[PDB]
Design a protein that fits this description.
part of a larger assembly, 4 chains, B: 452 residues, mainly alpha, C: 314 residues, alpha+beta, 8-stranded antiparallel β-sheet, 3-stranded antiparallel β-sheet, 18% strand, RNA-binding, rna binding protein/rna
Chain lengths: 516, 452, 314, 416
RNA sequence: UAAUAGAAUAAGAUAUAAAA
RNA sequence: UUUUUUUAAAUAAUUU
């Protein structure tokens, strides 16, 4: 209900009859987001007028995040809005502050422009000396967020930052380290010197500093393992009380570095699984993966981690079903309940899984005994038949192998898979075996298909071992190939690795020997 | 559909396009995809280059023009972030921008052309074929990029890194661009010969069609193609029979042993012939020059039951081919004339002139088609050559048309190209017919040019 | 024929050839037995037949749809990167490549999505059919008006049927939809009650249009074309301005006097007209009624792809 | 009589003729003063008064073309010269943006209307396209119609000589700053008239034979129909100035025509120059390499392979001996010459080597010291290795400076 | 007053043209 | 059966 004065002001704002500056629209939007008494968000004819007022105003007065907030509060209602792009300063508008603001505007409002980045960099170089120490760190952070490829300027900035080592604090040092590690093309000399500086001032570090340093070392790689050593020694006296995210980062760095002093690994994992219940979904997934990769999943380890992950198992993200599914394999521990809940969740989201994820899930469930008697096999078969157009060779091989191992019988799907695999040739034997496995379930195929299959398998018989030779022979006999060049090629290899025939020789091989 | 993010929308749009351009054109999938893509926006969300390229491609494929918002937002993103468009999503962007004809589309296509020119040496088997096909979709004349890509294709094909589908795609892409290179096509033919049994009929017919279209004038490979195709006749479909008819008319060499078997197989499947197949076969017979009445009677009879299926192109080709060979079919001619009168607004610039001349050459005048074609000539006068303008003017004079609103455009066009108009000897007789009707009063300057 | 693999899903060069309606705004058209939901009350019909005009009680479009339609209108007048399918338009103010303070477009239903869809909108076509005595109703043509901010002009008094003299019988109606909130300070529609029955269903003399003059004189030129009795009826019932929301629709008789105000707000104002015509309608001369359209002869019934039948009471 | 409206492209004269004549006289006087220079304030005062007169004339012309229906009544050649002057006076900076756009919009409208009528001949299309794309004036319909009409190869058959040369020169001169969107349509012009130029092969002047070849090769176009144009040039070497020979060598290399017999004559004509520069020496080395790469050790003439190689090496040394007179602008020139001489094992005297290394020393020192101004790290590695191979006694300063550059890290990487 | 990231994947006819 | 390349190149002419 709008009284007379309120209604008249609403009408005046509705008719675009009032000139609004950026500050006033920001204040009104803040009031609306804070309090909903007058129903500002419930009048489309009012927020539409406010949006029209916002478009035709000078947005350069307010800070970048204020413009981003107005855009977000208009997007939430249902109006597609985007703050205007800032122009590069020209002539005397040149200053360090405006050149930082251009990057900040491009960062916050999600409007990345490589041409404007290049223009700004080509104009900030001469005055690099005038820059203050904090502005250098801000520029490094902004360039790291924008994924700029101009590693030379970032290196120059990093050198000028190192020249003021005394001025900078622990937080600035950590921010510079991580922002340098994120740039791909940075020279390794500057990286070595920056990690050397991080190596000292080690006791001053805070949990945020520890997280930044561990992120940088995970990004960098084994080449800096030595520095990481002094980190794990440094935290050996605080390990009994650390944040769960810090211990997860420690496990990730342990897995990446291929650390080999096992006592530190065991102590840190033991400290982690005490407070593992505080981890988010993503961090829990990565703790599980890192622990698996280090060969540390004992019985209690796996039990505790599975109990912690079963909570998020109800609403798992699609990207997180496959990794835990893999971890549940390759371990001799009971994980029936986790498997069942994960399979149910996988069934729930069968219409949003990409081709690669569907192939991975079918591969992981291929040999699972309790996965045959489930609706997932049929649902995933239909989904794979639909998605065969979007599947690469690896995804095709994975899905077809998983379906063949699961007992799914559908001749049309296997014929279509064989055609799609004939579109792009099979590079490896592992990429071709699933097609044979699928086609051998029914036991028949058109003669042209078996001829093309024989033509493909014939060159690959030169390098496969005896077991592969036997499997290929079995599949070819099941399909019914008559081509002689194949059988001849398979025969020769057999002889080379087995000299001449013998009564002892297996009958099938002896037949294979006859080049039927 | 609201809970789907932009990435899932892009994936499902690609799925819908793949289902529609391959497994039927169900008018339901197209309209659902149009409705979904009409209410999507890339605004305020961080997206990969591949997802934006997929959205742009699937939007443009479904009719969306260069005025739509989604298209504008994707084009702006492709302009601003150029180094994020790697060699994997270059073909998608180029294919999407092929049909869009504006300033931004031209700029993006040029930038991607230069990027592919620089990195032409580091591509692999998939990338060369995808990029060359995508650049064949758009009409561009970057010769240096084509030379680099052909060199890389030869280097890859020497070691044998191409399949049957790759060979068909490469042959069609290089034939569509009119890039005549003998070594590249020799290498493609040799790669197919090495493939041997891995090429089936469905992957063999387009190879022959493209190899004939490029026009290498090499009689060594035409005979080999004919011999290879001679074994596969019994497995062919009617569309494939018409395709080889057209291809071996394009080659220009006479192979009687092949033409006889092709004719027998075409007669066998006479009930499966549509109007397009009949028009293609008659055009191929006109081009090659052979005169075979036995097949012609069956083709004409089957064309009589599918009159309603005829397009403008099919009517034009069929009527011209029938008139060249001097075949008389009064019922077929009358039905074709009426149908052409019904769809007179579907004739292109040259199809109209060919149809009118073919109808006028034989003594068959019908007012229904005459009025429609004469009225439609105004909108195609401006896209005509000198000889085509002469043919249209003669056909119009045969129809006894005197409306100035029709005759002013054609006279203007023939006056603008008078030199080539009066320098073609084969039409000289036609000239003396035209001014035998209109007389010196009609367009005196043309008469003064004629006297000189 | 053979359509290339990458051109299978495209639309015709002009949307006239598209039979039916695309699903862009409101999805697919309802079934044959589902057209009774959009019927209008008889009192609205009586109000139209009495006043010569009426307003539909409910907005005909959701706000997202109005946003999309406003985007289409904005793109129809780009003037830097001209609209595709601009050559499919009956007339445009950008034919001089310069534009101005007033942008008017005609026949845009063959140019853009949504605008073509809006023609077959059930809520308005059923109402217009009810006004036209439950007959088949065929689109006559559309129109788009866009007035710039702080300088937008006003179109003076006019009669719609004055522009359709080439059409024989008086069987028409107009539906005007607001694409932006309108008021007397931005392009509001001002109509005279009971003016469609003044000259025994006749046409008043055309008004004198003198541009580059204030809005007051442009709207006051009405005292020049009317007679004494029309003056008395004017004095009893002075012209009324109608406020419209972002989606509200207004039905107008072809013969009622009609004007729109100027635009003095701080943003451009948009509105769209669509004229609807009854089945029993003939031509008077020989030739095309509109530029580059199918030509008729003597008193021929008006049909073809250029005047599609949008609704059928059977 | 039919109301035809066909006017010759190059009678029906209006006041546009007088206005364009006045503009012609003013432009001619301004160019005459500009030549007369070779009193700057005085000549700039006269230029100011002449540009004022031209601005007044064009303002009157645009007012007339706006108010009265003059474009329909005028002929066609007047339209051509009006387009020429409107597109030319903007580049000379005598017109404002608003007036330029106002004139060009109506010129485009009139041209589109006449195209719709069908009067546009086969020469007017080329003229309009050439004089519109080079000014980068955009109108969607005009550009699309011109591009679509330039694919009717049958019309463009009997173009005159002067039209061919004028269009080629106009497209050639303004190539540097062209926007990307303008490039593609440019090519569609050159290939529209490619067959006519190919037939016109025996009429071009020797100098022009190079202008047309360069105009085609800069727009990365090497059509088959232009093949005789190059061949004649190969048969007419010796009439070219020595500087032109380097460009000829590059062109012939890019047309897949360069062979040994023509390479010998090109190298000989190069060596006849009074004093060499970087361009001719670099071109000669590139030609020697590309001709040495063409000998097969197991072909039909395999037994003749080795002597030919020797000959090439010999004609390398003639160029290699005179390697001190040139002035290298950039390091890649030096690196290319040195790669050519090292790979092919040409012998070079020590004096030219010392001159080369001393010249490179100043460039690397400037790059190291200024650091404010693009020598990559791999190029520097190559230069260091080359100096080490030929001996560090040639330039002791360059070795130490160059090693210090490696130590500090001034030189960026190729990825950046 | 306001800043956190994951995925690697291929469809295919526009009515032309002289020499190991 | 096999035959292909790696410059910053700038000198045409006109009243269009």
């Amino acid at each position: 209900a709008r009284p007379s004065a309120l209604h008249l002001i609403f009408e005046r704002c509705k008719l675009n009859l009032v000139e609004f500056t950026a500050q006033d629209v920001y204040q009104i939007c803040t009031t609306a987001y804070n309090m909903d008494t007058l129903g500002m968000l419930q009048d489309p004819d009012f927020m539409r007028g406010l949006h029209d007022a916002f478009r035709r105003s000078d947005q350069t007065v307010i800070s970048p995040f204020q413009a981003n907030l107005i855009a977000d509060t208009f997007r939430k209602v249902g109006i597609n809005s985007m703050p205007k792009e800032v122009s590069v300063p020209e002539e005397d508008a040149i200053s360090p502050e405006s050149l930082i603001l251009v990057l900040r505007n491009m960062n916050i409002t999600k409007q990345r422009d490589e041409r404007k980045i290049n223009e700004v960099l080509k104009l900030m170089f001469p005055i690099l000396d005038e820059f203050s120490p904090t502005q250098l760190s801000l520029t490094v952070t902004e360039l790291a967020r924008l994924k700029s490829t101009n590693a030379d300027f970032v290196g120059k900035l990093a050198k000028r930052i190192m020249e003021y080592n005394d001025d900078l604090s622990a937080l600035d040092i950590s921010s510079a380290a991580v922002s340098l590690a994120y740039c791909p093309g940075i020279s390794h000399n500057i990286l070595y010197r920056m990690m050397q500086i991080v190596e000292e001032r080690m006791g001053e570090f805070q949990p945020e500093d520890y997280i930044n340093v561990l992120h940088a070392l995970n990004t960098l790689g084994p080449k800096f393992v030595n520095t990481f050593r002094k980190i794990v020694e440094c935290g050996l006296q605080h390990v009994e009380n650390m944040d769960a995210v810090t211990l997860t980062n420690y496990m990730v760095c342990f897995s990446t570095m291929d650390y080999k002093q096992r006592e530190h690994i065991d102590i840190y994992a033991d400290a982690l699984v005490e407070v593992a219940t505080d981890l988010s979904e993503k961090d829990l997934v990565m703790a599980f993966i890192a622990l698996q990769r280090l060969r540390l999943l004992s019985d209690t380890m796996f039990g505790t981690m599975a109990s912690c992950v079963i909570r998020y198992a109800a609403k798992m993200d699609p990207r997180n079903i496959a990794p835990i599914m893999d971890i549940c394999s390759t371990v001799p521990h009971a994980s029936d309940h986790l498997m069942k809940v994960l399979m149910d969740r996988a069934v729930e989201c069968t219409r949003i899984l990409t081709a690669n994820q569907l192939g991975d899930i079918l591969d992981i469930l291929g040999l699972y005994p309790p996965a045959r008697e489930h609706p997932l096999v049929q649902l995933f078969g239909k989904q794979a038949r639909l998605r065969l157009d979007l599947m690469g060779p690896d995804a095709l091989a994975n899905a077809t192998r998983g379906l063949a191992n699961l007992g799914y019988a559908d001749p049309e799907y296997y014929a279509q898979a064989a055609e799609t695999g004939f579109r792009y040739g099979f590079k490896d034997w592992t990429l071709l075996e699933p097609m044979l496995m699928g086609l051998s379930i029914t036991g028949q195929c058109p003669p042209t298909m078996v001829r093309v299959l024989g033509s493909h398998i014939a060159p690959m018989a030169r390098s496969m071992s005896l077991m592969e030779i036997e499997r290929a022979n079995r599949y070819l006999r099941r399909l019914g190939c008559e081509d002689d060049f194949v059988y001849k090629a398979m025969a020769s290899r057999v002889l080379q690795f087995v000299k001449e025939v013998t009564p002892e020789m297996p009958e099938d091989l002896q037949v294979l020997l006859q080049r039927g | 559909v609201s809970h789907l993010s932009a990435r899932n929308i892009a994936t499902e749009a690609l799925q819908m396009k793949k289902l529609h351009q391959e497994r039927g054109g169900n008018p339901m999938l197209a309209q659902q995809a149009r409705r979904v893509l009409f209410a999507t926006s890339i605004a305020g969300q961080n997206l990969d280059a591949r997802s934006v390229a997929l959205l742009l491609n699937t939007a443009v494929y479904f009719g969306m023009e260069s005025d739509a918002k989604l298209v504008r937002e994707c084009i702006d993103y492709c302009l601003k972030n150029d180094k994020l468009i790697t060699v994997d999503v270059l073909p998608i962007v180029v294919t999407a921008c092929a049909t869009l004809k504006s300033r931004d589309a031209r700029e993006v296509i040029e930038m991607q052309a230069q990027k592919a020119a620089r990195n032409a040496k580091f591509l692999d088997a998939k990338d060369v074929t995808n990029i060359i096909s995508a650049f064949s979709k758009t009409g561009i004349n970057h010769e240096k990029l084509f030379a680099f890509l052909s060199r890389r294709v030869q280097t890859l094909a020497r070691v044998g890194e191409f399949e049957a589908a790759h060979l068909v795609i490469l042959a069609n892409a290089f034939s569509r661009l009119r890039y005549r290179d003998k070594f590249l096509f020799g290498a493609i033919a040799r790669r197919a010969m090495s493939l041997r049994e891995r090429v089936t009929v469905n992957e063999l017919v387009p190879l022959i069609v493209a190899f004939s279209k490029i026009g290498l004038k090499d009689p060594k490979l035409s005979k080999r193609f004919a011999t290879k195709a001679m074994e596969y006749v019994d497995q062919m479909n009617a569309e494939q029979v018409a395709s080889m008819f057209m291809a071996f008319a394009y080659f220009g060499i006479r192979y009687d042993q092949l033409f006889g078997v092709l004719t027998n197989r075409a007669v066998e499947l006479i009930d499966e012939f549509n109007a397009q197949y009949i028009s293609t076969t008659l055009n191929a017979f006109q081009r090659i020059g052979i005169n075979n009445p036995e097949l012609f009677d069956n083709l004409a009879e089957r064309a009589l039951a599918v009159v309603q299926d005829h397009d403008a192109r099919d009517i034009s080709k069929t009527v011209t081919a029938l008139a060249h060979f001097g075949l008389k079919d009064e019922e077929l001619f009358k039905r074709l004339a009426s149908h052409a009168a019904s769809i007179a607004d579907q004739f292109d610039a040259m199809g109209l002139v060919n149809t009118a001349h073919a109808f006028a050459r034989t003594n068959f005048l019908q007012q229904d088609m005459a009025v429609a074609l004469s009225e439609r000539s105004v909108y195609v006068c401006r896209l005509l050559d000198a000889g085509e303008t002469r043919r249209l003017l003669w056909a119009l004079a045969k129809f006894q048309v005197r409306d100035p609103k029709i005759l002013t455009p054609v006279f203007n066009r023939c006056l603008a190209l008078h030199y080539d108009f009066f320098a073609d000897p084969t039409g000289s007789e036609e000239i003396e017919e035209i001014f035998d009707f209109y007389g010196p009063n009609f367009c005196p300057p043309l008469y003064q040019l004629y006297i000189s | 024929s053979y359509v290339l693999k990458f051109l299978r899903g495209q639309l015709p060069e002009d949307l006239k050839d598209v039979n039916g309606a695309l699903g862009c705004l409101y999805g697919t058209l309802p079934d044959v037995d589902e057209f009774g939901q959009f019927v209008i009350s008889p009192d609205v019909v009586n109000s139209f037949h009495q006043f010569g005009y009426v307003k539909m009680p409910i907005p005909v479009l959701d706000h997202q749809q109005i946003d999309k339609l406003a985007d289409e209108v904005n793109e129809l007048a780009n003037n830097v990167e001209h609209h595709p399918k601009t050559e499919r338009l009956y007339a445009t103010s950008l034919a001089d490549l310069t534009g101005g303070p007033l942008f008017f477009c005609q026949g845009q239903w063959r140019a853009a999505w949504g605008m073509h869809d809006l023609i077959y909108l059930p809520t308005i076509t059923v109402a217009a059919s009810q006004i036209l005595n439950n007959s088949l109703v065929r689109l006559w043509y559309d129109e788009v008006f866009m007035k710039a901010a702080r300088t937008g002009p006003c179109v003076p008094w006019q009669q719609n049927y004055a522009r359709w003299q080439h059409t024989k019988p008086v069987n028409h109606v107009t539906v005007m939809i607001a694409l932006d909130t309108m008021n007397k300070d931005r392009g509001a529609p001002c109509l005279v009650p009971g003016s469609h029955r003044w000259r025994e269903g006749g046409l008043l003399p055309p008004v004198s249009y003198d541009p580059t003059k204030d809005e007051a004189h442009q709207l006051n030129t009405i005292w020049e074309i009317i007679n004494e009795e029309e003056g008395e009826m004017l004095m009893d019932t002075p012209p009324v301005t109608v406020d419209l929301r972002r989606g509200e629709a207004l039905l107008i008789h072809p013969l009622t006097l009609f004007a729109t105000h100027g635009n003095r707000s701080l943003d451009a104002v948009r509105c769209c007209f669509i004229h609807y015509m009854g089945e029993k309608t003939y031509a008077v001369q020989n030739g095309p009624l509109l530029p580059h359209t199918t030509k008729f002869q003597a008193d021929a019934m008006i049909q073809g792809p250029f005047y599609p039948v949008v609704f059928d009471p059977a | 009589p039919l109301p035809v409206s066909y006017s010759p492209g190059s009678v029906t004269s209006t006041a546009i003729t007088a206005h364009c004549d006045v503009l012609s006289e003013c432009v001619a006087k301004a160019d005459e003063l500009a030549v007369q220079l070779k009193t700057q304030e005085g000549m700039e005062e006269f230029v100011e008064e002449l540009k004022t007169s031209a601005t007044n004339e064009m303002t009157a012309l645009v007012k007339q073309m706006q108010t009265t229906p003059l474009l329909q009544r005028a002929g066609m050649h007047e339209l051509r010269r009006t387009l020429y002057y409107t597109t030319s006076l903007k580049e000379r900076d005598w017109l404002e943006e608003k007036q330029y756009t106002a004139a060009m919009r109506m010129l485009t409208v009139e041209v589109l209307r006449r195209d719709g009528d069908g009067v546009l001949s086969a020469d007017d299309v080329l003229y309009v396209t050439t004089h519109v794309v080079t000014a980068n004036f955009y109108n969607r319909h005009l550009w699309n119609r011109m591009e679509k009409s330039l694919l009717k190869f049958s019309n463009y058959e009997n173009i005159d000589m002067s039209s061919v040369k004028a269009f080629s020169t106009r497209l050639f001169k303004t190539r540097r700053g062209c926007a990307k969107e303008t490039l593609d349509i440019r090519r569609k012009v050159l290939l529209a008239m490619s067959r006519r130029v190919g037939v016109l092969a025996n009429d071009f002047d020797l100098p022009s034979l190079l202008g047309v070849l360069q105009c085609y090769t800069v727009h990365d176009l090497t059509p088959f129909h232009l093949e005789p144009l190059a061949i004649r040039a190969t048969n007419h070497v010796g009439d070219f100035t020595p500087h032109e020979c380097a460009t000829l060598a590059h062109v012939l290399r890019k047309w897949r025509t360069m062979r040994l017999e023509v390479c010998e004559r090109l190298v000989e004509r190069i060596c006849t120059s009074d004093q060499l520069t970087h361009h001719m020496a670099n071109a000669a080395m590139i030609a020697i390499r590309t001709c040495f790469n063409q000998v097969s050790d197991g072909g039909r003439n395999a037994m003749n392979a080795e002597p030919t190689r020797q000959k090439l090496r010999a004609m390398g040394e003639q160029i290699g001996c005179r390697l001190d007179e040139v002035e290298y602008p950039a390091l890649p020139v030096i690196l290319s010459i040195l790669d050519v001489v090292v790979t092919l094992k040409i012998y070079v005297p020590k004096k030219c080597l010392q001159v080369i290394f001393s010249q490179a020393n100043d460039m690397v020192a400037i790059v190291m010291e200024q650091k404010d101004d693009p020598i990559t790290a791999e190029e520097g590695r190559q230069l260091q290795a080359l100096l080490s191979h030929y001996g560090n006694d040639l330039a002791p300063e360059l070795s130490q400076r160059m090693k210090e550059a490696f130590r500090e890290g001034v030189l960026p990487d190729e990825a950046s």
